[PDB]
């Protein structure tokens, strides 16, 4: 798996349209994708014996990459746990794996989102790079209906070489990012 639609149809379409739209000097001066990083978080290192790398492999299906556990630092005595030993759950996607995920996300996921209308327009709001989150885990294709103990969500963050959030606002809408402007 070495070249997908978003891959190809970035260099052979979206690439030139931005050197036009903005008039750059360098192949490096144009915006690219750096990285996509998803985070689950939850907070379920509690009682009743809490396993939940059970739900970290169902995350590894949709992405293909195996996620690392992320731990705690302070202590919310207000709503339980402290110290360390916790739940937060994370994975960093770079290239190929990157596009493959984004591919199915744009073709099959956001479509599957119960009502939907388009992504929120200004979750860049300035600082280059973009962020979105989700309620459901089953709007994903490779994850089934009958293998759910309990639906849950995630926080998808997408990074970019572009300085301003104009340069970025373009690059993503061109690869097919549905916007509720």
């Amino acid at each position: 798996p070495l070249d997908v639609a978003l891959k190809r149809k970035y260099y052979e379409e979206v690439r030139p349209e931005l050197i036009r739209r903005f008039g750059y000097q360098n192949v490096w001066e144009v915006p690219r994708l750096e990285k996509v990083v998803i985070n689950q978080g939850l907070g379920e290192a509690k009682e009743d014996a809490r396993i939940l790398e059970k739900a970290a492999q169902e995350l590894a299906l949709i992405t293909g990459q195996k996620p690392a556990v992320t731990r705690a630092k302070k202590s919310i005595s207000n709503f339980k746990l402290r110290k360390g030993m916790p739940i937060g759950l994370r994975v960093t996607l770079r290239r190929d794996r990157m596009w493959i995920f984004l591919e199915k996300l744009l073709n099959v996921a956001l479509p599957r989102i119960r009502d939907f209308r388009g992504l929120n327009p200004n979750s860049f709001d300035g600082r280059g790079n973009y962020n979105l989150g989700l309620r459901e885990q089953l709007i994903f294709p490779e994850i089934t209906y009958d293998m759910v103990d309990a639906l849950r969500g995630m926080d998808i963050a997408v990074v970019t070489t572009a300085e301003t959030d104009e340069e970025a606002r373009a690059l993503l809408e061109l690869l097919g990012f549905p916007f509720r402007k």
Binding site: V4, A5, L106
Partner: peptide, 30 residues
Amino acid sequence: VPARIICGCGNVIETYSTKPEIYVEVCSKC
């Protein structure tokens, strides 16, 4: 591995994932 997604709206998308057999009710075509 490489894979095919099979919509309830006829269409067939060809990407990769794991497990190649995928019945989906609707992609980006409605």
